[PDB]
Design a binder for these strands. Structure first.
Length: 91
DNA sequence: AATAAAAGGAAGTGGG
DNA sequence: TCCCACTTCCTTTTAT
């Protein structure tokens, strides 16, 4: 299937769910979730993966944190803010 | 305070 | 079989 970072990047590069997620600095890959609207986006991720349960922002961030080990997505020390690697922003 | 976020271990799921 | 890439579940810590 489709990887979570890819799903997120595709929404950012096509501008859907701007009420739920947006660039903080596009050229640096840094993006941010909305406090109020992030659950619509979590829900959409879970629908698209066919998961048994309703996907939530907390479970999605749990996955997001695993990218910290590999490097695709780094947590920034700002509320609800993350950062794609340069490698991810190419392909 | 209070509370939303961040954290992360551990066993579970799909599908290749 | 095994491994990947999450997903689920829960308590504890940290940041606002």
């Amino acid at each position: 299937k489709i990887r979570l970072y890819q799903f997120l990047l595709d929404l950012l590069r096509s501008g859907d769910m701007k009420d739920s997620i947006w660039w903080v600095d596009k050229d640096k890959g840094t993006f941010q979730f909305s406090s109020k609207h992030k659950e619509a986006l979590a829900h959409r991720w879970g629908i698209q993966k066919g998961n048994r349960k309703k996907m939530t922002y907390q479970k999605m961030a749990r996955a997001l944190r695993n990218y910290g080990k590999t490097g695709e997505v780094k947590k920034v020390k700002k509320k609800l803010t993350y950062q794609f690697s340069g490698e991810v922003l190419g392909r």
